[PDB]
């Protein structure tokens, strides 16, 4: 059990490279559009404080070095959606695949494949954080990387990558252009809320664990929900739903542990610790799995 | 500082699908040569003790069913190579990436797609244990998936699965079939040496916590590498290599700690233990980072 992204294939087919002026970041290449983060206009003085429209409005399509591989791509439009930039080309991507533009909530997980002049270095698996950041690894020049899912061949695309946090983490927006969080494609230092525990996730994870054969932090005991949500708020870990629990009921049946039992587990674990133990080779809570994850993985 | 996998693309465009009578696993199509396990050609009771020679004797060309999704590629050639079936087929496969075949030495990692009726999956990442497992995650029907390295656009093949062990670990071959550790392509439990930590990449790790300013741990003192590797061994550490050194090196450059050097401040974690303290955040020394994952997200 790792964890593991999606095939990275029918989005690589799609990764192009902009440059205005002397910024250069990743698009999105889908038809004859192609979709990037739009402080690829700004300069560095612009980033402090730049206003889009106005600096857009002064902006042709000939100032738009669009790159697919070596073949460079003609701009004959371009047009704003909030912090993304479509660029209108006169070709379409032949690649394309059956897309659609989702945006994910709090607690689902992507895979995002990393790319630094429009070609791509790695793909790995991420979550939407509760504070709406993601724990990811890019680099300069990763602006434009998207997250996405993959079901029977149609790619769900929920994120393009803008900024790290001093913190390390990273804020991005989705394909409509809408930041997640509270955060501005503007060139300050910038914190987030308070994160938070997903804690569904971490229960679809204690039970892949025992599916695989882990089974040191299971008890006798079990819990009521809601008490199980005050000790869970009191070590910030996010309350459980209704549906949460029912979203559980696969692992359950197929391991037989319910999940109001599998919460006293995860009580006493945020009570006692892990006593130096690991469960999946993991020291820490792990909280990135959905059960979705977990249950496409295990069967 | 993640796990992170190779893109998949240039792998996906040759995963296939090899059917004989009801046994099916995936196969990898690069020009007009299909490679997959032998032990398609099997039914599930001469897997418990086949005889691959005797078994291929009688199979012919037609009983070999390729398909590129539901698209058949005519077999007109088959040979066996250690454990693994060499189909030619009738069409060079046009997606065939530049590519090589290398057999790695333990500590490496690669990207692993897992597969299942040709069909791509999944990807993540694996590092080869010293006991020549690997900690995967494989289903039924994942035989013929394979692990890979991409360098500069060319696709270096390394491993192509074939079992798990009861331990839960999984076992296979490199891309001339050969098996990576003492593993046999029959359908039996099969038990794998003891596992150690793989020095190379803790000591990548370390390398690592500096270059990101988390260097309490280095110390005074040096050591040679014949002391090291024995000290080590008495923890259950693998020995290093003159290739472990050198491929330290670029990281030993950058910044400016001699390998031996950060052996002794490894010797000394081995030797008193962390005390509580961290190193990037964690308390465990974590060793599947070769020197080149780190590089390549630095
Ligand atoms: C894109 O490449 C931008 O073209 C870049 C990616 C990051 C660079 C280092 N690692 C990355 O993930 N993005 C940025 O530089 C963004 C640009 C904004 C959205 C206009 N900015 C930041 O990530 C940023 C700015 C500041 C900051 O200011 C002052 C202070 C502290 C952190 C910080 N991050
Ligand atoms: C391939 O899919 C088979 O073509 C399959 C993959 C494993 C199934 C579960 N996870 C996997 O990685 N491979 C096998 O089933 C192989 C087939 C051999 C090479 C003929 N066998 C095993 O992996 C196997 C057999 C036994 C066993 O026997 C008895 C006892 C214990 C473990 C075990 N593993």
């Not at 250069?24 to 983060?37: A, H």
């Not at 006798?220 to 029912?246: G, I, S, W």
């Not at 674990?269 to 133990?277: A, E, H, K, T, V």
């Amino acid at each position: 059990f790792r964890k593991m992204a999606f095939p990275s294939g029918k989005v690589e087919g799609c990764m192009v490279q902009v440059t205005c002026g002397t910024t250069t970041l990743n698009g999105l290449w889908l038809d004859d559009v192609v979709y990037c983060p739009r402080h690829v206009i700004c300069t560095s003085e612009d980033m402090l404080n730049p206003n889009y429209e106005d600096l857009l409005i002064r902006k042709s399509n000939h100032n738009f070095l669009v790159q697919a591989g070596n073949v460079q791509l003609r701009v004959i439009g371009h047009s704003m959606q909030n912090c993304v930039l479509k660029l209108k080309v006169d070709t379409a991507n032949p690649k394309t695949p059956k897309y659609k533009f989702v945006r994910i909530q709090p607690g689902q997980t992507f895979s995002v494949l990393a790319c630094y002049n429009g070609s791509p270095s790695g793909v790995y698996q991420c979550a939407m954080r509760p504070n709406f950041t993601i724990k990811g690894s890019f680099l300069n020049g990763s602006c434009g990387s998207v997250g996405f899912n993959i079901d029977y061949d149609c790619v769900s695309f929920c994120y393009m990558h803008h900024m790290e946090l001093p913190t390390g983490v990273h804020a991005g927006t989705d394909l409509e252009g809408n930041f997640y969080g509270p955060f501005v494609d503007r060139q300050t230092a910038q914190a987030a809320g308070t994160d938070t525990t997903i804690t569904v996730n971490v229960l679809a994870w204690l039970y892949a664990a025992v599916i695989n054969g882990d089974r040191w932090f299971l008890n006798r005991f079990t819990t009521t929900l809601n008490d199980f949500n005050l000790v869970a708020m009191k070590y910030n870990y996010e309350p459980l739903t209704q549906d949460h629990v029912d979203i559980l009921g696969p692992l359950s049946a197929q391991t037989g542990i319910a999940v109001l039992d599998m919460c006293a587990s995860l009580k006493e674990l945020l009570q006692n610790g892990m006593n130096g133990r690991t469960i999946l080779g993991s020291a820490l809570l792990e909280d990135e799995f959905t059960p979705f994850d977990v249950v496409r993985q295990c069967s």
